[PDB]
């Protein structure tokens, strides 16, 4: 079954029912003010800080699911009804949601008015708008009143659900009916002390009414589908004191047959300069200037169109960079418009809020940010360029680093723990792929402070030293990286034997001493150490690259010496010495991580695909036996069945979920590129289709999620659910997706010097041409490919035949037309 | 006016309709399991601590409020209501709820459909037990199929509610359709790792079907009053996995005309001992032992009915301690039920959980927990000396203190910030108010450790001396303490200057510095410091005693010199030695703590109620004029306006609520006995009725909240909502009114070494007698009260005339006889 369907001219997904399997959200917003927007109007939005300046207020885990959002309430001749459907549920004749970049549309229609609503987070502004289409579709005139409705939230998303005993007494608004361009409210709540900032809620008309207090709007006894104002058909002129700030206006309007009227309400973020917080001496009156300025911007439905057509442009722009034309409609949708987009999405948010993520706990992941760095540099790499310098003055001078910030400071915290020894290496990712992309080795050289100390910076490169440094001197007794808190996986915790129940595995004190070693950080040292070498090289560090090589060497030969099982690499030396994921103990025999790792990092490849003596291959293979299923590949094969007191978080879910059986999807493109990397494509977009949006898109009741993005984690085949996804739109699935099938499925990818050129994809996509502007040059790539296990391109460039696969970069403003035979 | 009515042969309160002003609770159970319980049946229940152990899942601002609890549908031909009226919301020809003394009763009928339910803890029981009486009203028979619900929380409530990235994957259940006794749903979560407890939910019958899976019962975009199975007429039989866990039976029931049928359903808590969790040796399925005896011992009406019987002995044998006879019966129903049963809880809960505290950030106040004291050692005199060791044992080496600790680990923490300056001396007041009861001089030698360590102990005394060290060792340049990061007014942060939005005051960074004194604690000094000495005394330690006498007496002659404004008593001086709470200041120029302790403490007593030369007479005259409402009194008048940087929090609220400007009920009672003290009887006991919950029941409608308990905050006068209160149960209120009322008002109170009988009333209760069994006697005293100010007591006692007011111990089993003319 199906609810909807792309629109790959218009950069939409289609929803045609409100009567999904779970709420499908779209994100606005791309710079510094964000908003959650379901299909049926729900989420919230906040500034930069989803827990520290969360706008409007959103219940989590509410019955139903998701009855909380931007409503308009419909009242005609008595009868009333949301066009978002929920939350009223009144029938409507019809119904639909599209999910653009940046903006949404949501249409009811029910007795002859039809309601259409555009949602969208304007360039450069800290706001929602939302411009509402009113239209008589009957053959008789229409009087309706519309009234909207927003819940604030008091900023503190932590405080706003907890703290009642001091927050229910601090609610403070202020209504201005009769503004320059039409109605507004004002939520002020600790402005009054702290706080140099309010909401704004207003129309661009003067309103007959609003209402501002939670109880008085809805009524006593009363859901939000229920609400008593709406059904009254006149708003109460509620002016809150305390309990729950909301903004309200009505509209009553009059339509003949056919006519239509628009209306357009802002939803605003203001901040006032200390000294210019108040309008008046007696400072108890906001200062209003900067939320007239932003409703005189919207003021008009022609200003709302030139922003949305400025955004339509902004995205043309952001998705001109890289792009492919095939015979695979759904492996294109996914590489021009929906896997670029959700880059940018994850970018932003890192794994903060979500209608999963709470945006309680999760600031901006050290790791995870600098992965999401790997499928964004391409977008806007001054934008990565910043985001480096921001996870770099995070860490600490021994190059260990919090494992995240606070998006609103910056500042790096504990909250979800800390010693998590795989974090540094990430560092080393996320420079590497920065510098192939945009070639700005000045980055290199960028003052960086640690732990954000002013007058402690060093140059960047020199955090990087620190990062590889990190894992020379912290090595276990096979010469194998000592595991820390967990490696990639936060669940893996070896140094933890915790017997104390609803204490964090994350956060929970670790034993000092034993011996646990990761054969993944292992496997991430050598492809990153590499990297690290060949900077220091390019930096004029000549012995210090040679000795980087040396150590790369000693801990890719301790990989082969101690790491490896027999038919797959080993995962780990637990606290005692002895080996995680082996043939020997019945469960977690085989786990994916070090096997899709390794092999990326070249340990183990031998001559070819066919040779089924390198330890690469059989990895590979244990990997399609044992962890293959039709939705993807499971973590590790078979999941725990008992609590396994030395390995931490991991068996503690039940088996097929999450980190105990569940296809992880993130560390599923590690597999994916490591089949490339054999010669195996056909296996690879194999992979690849397994767990993608598009091609998944045909089981919506069984993915149950968003169909248009990747979800964390998809119901393993030990899980009663096999094939449910919880956790979408916030994943490293996104990036690291996109760097396999942008770089190494379609296997086009910038390095220092050069663009490689070399497909391994097989023979299901036997014709395609990309498109590639790398360092100010436009490449056009035409491919076609016979798919036949283990070839590898050649080139032709403008009409010269080239050796090797890899193009030097042309001058900026050239075209380059290269011809590759696969 | 009023929505129920008191019922005091039955120590109940009946409320007579579903549409009171606000939720309305009891709680159930006075030992180690706890139930909040509205007149709607919503609410939750946890074992010991409400934040670690939560069993079912509750929402706070919900829409609408209290949504969620215990319920049971009725299909009736189709038709489905809930007794309790929500959320079902169904005209109920007859609906009501009564909550009693450790249980509660809600009935509702519809169309010749009567269910009662008997909700309630049984002594000695980790478990809530309901039992339902269904009857048919009408003259044919009836047939209807129940379906119980009850929504499990996942046992830390704070991850319930924030980390469903995590436990969406972690809900696990059993369904056990033929047990024992009937049917019963196991709420296993986290017992397959670190948890040795589960829950269960069964009935004493076999089910017709059940529901573990939330979104199976109530169906895709429904609220709870539109749950599709009921509406259905047949339980799914869903076995969650993940997701939201339930508990759920169908019974089918026929009832001839007038008959009616019991069903007995069991909420409980087990654990299993590590080596007996399992009834299977591959360890999937929990030893069901303990849940299958406990429901054993709640198979029949006649078990459920002896158990009330014996819950009913215990409340009788509570309240056996003091009683009151007099001509006011709001007075009567105060003393003899409400204020003694709420202190109960206030023992229990201190401020964790209500229907405002969300039991997630408070645990044990210190503060807090002492002062329950105060109300509660007249009750189980065994139970508060427990208390007593538990929170001194949260105390460090210099005297300081853990301002709260964990419920159930007994361990300080810092969670709502530490070094309040205030916490140590009510560690005397609590230990002085155990002694003068109970007589137990031995609790003194008890060994205590400092912050749980184990071997530095030492005897109690030695904890009390460390407390009355700290204050003399940290007076400032007045000789008046120091107050750290606030006093007993969480609010007054002296230390603090927060410009920073977001960090609360409570656990923002101290400034270190400065000379910021408390004028409130140097009276809290003065009073406690003496109960210390004469502790000293009494151990013969007459050094220390004497020493200790000296320095009381230096702070009492310091609030005199630098403490004393002219009409009242200062508050504070800041950080820089400013004046806090002085008429040259425009607002807050006065506060009421000091006012009420300082007079308590003996400060400025002079030669009777009109002398008014009198410092206390003075100060007390400007409490009345400048703080005085009818809804109790001010904390301070004027409230600040304006944000004040040197003050911290309290400038922070809208004027009129909470600390700044708020009735904050618990400082009331220090008015009231200061009044007392100084011989103004009618005045005392004008401003005890003014907060007491019988004498503003019937203005329920302004209150809003429960009319049988006390809040924490009445809007004060400079409030639009004037006269409505929040946080309302969880009040150190409920101890101080009870304080006041016994001891000072009525005026029976234990000493050292006798019962004082000084009532101090005034003439609105011209006779009354008091029964107060006092270290296993019982006193008769009977009182004959002109009311004339300033008038004190003369005893004659079992037929002779006594000397003063202090009749001495009579030995355990005697009645004395004590007549009073006031
Ligand atoms: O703190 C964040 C982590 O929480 C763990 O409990 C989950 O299993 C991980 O997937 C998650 O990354
Ligand atoms: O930590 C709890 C404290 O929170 C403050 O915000 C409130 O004003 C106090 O009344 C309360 O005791
Ligand atoms: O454990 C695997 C992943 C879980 N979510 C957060 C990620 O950083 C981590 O790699
Ligand atoms: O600030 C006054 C009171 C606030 N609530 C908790 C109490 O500890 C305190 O005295």
Known sequence: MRYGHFDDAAREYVITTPHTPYPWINYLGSEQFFSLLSHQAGGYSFYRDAKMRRLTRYRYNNIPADAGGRYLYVNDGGDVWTPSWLPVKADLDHFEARHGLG?????????????????????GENAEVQKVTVTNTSDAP????????????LWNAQDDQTNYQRNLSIGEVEVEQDGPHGSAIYHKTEYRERRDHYAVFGVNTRADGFDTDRDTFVGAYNSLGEASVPRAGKSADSVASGWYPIGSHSVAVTLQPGESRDLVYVLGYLENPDEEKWADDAHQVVNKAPAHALLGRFATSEQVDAALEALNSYWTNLLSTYSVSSTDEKLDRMVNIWNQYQCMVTFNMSRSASFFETGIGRGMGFRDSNQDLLGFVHLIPERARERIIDIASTQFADGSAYHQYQPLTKRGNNDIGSGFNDDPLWLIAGVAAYIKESGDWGILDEPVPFDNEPGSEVPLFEHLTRSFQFTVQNRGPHGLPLIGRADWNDCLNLNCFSTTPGESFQTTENQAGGVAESVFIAAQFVLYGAEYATLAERRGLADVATEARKYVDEVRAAVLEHGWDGQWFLRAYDYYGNPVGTDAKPEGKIWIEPQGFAVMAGIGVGEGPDDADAPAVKALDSVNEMLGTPHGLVLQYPAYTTYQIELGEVSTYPPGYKENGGIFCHNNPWVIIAETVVGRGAQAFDYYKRITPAYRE?????????????????????????????????????????????????????????????????????????????????????????????????????????????????????????????
């Not at 229409?142 to 939230?153: D, G, N």
């Open 103 to 123: 903006y949404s549309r949501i249409t009811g229609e029910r007795n002859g008015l039809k309601v259409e609503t555009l949602f969208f987070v304007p360039l």
């Open 698 to 822: 045909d089981i919506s009741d069984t993915h149950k999620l968003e169909p248009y993005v990747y979800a964390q984690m998809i119901a393993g085949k030990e899980a009663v659910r096999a094939g449910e996804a919880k956790n979408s739109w916030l994943t490293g699935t996104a990036a690291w997706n996109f760097v396999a099938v942008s770089q190494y499925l379609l296997g086009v990818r910038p390095d220092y010097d050069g663009l490689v050129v070399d497909p391994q994809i097989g023979p299901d996509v036997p014709s395609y041409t990309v498109t590639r502007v790398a360092r100010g040059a436009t490449y056009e790539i035409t491919v076609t490919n016979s798919g036949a296990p283990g070839a590898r391109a050649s080139l032709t460039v403008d009409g010269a035949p080239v050796d090797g696969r890899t193009v030097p970069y042309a001058p900026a403003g050239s075209t380059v037309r290269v011809e590759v035979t696969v």
């Open 142 to 153: 229409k009087t309706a009143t519309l009234f909207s409705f927003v819940e604030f939230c």
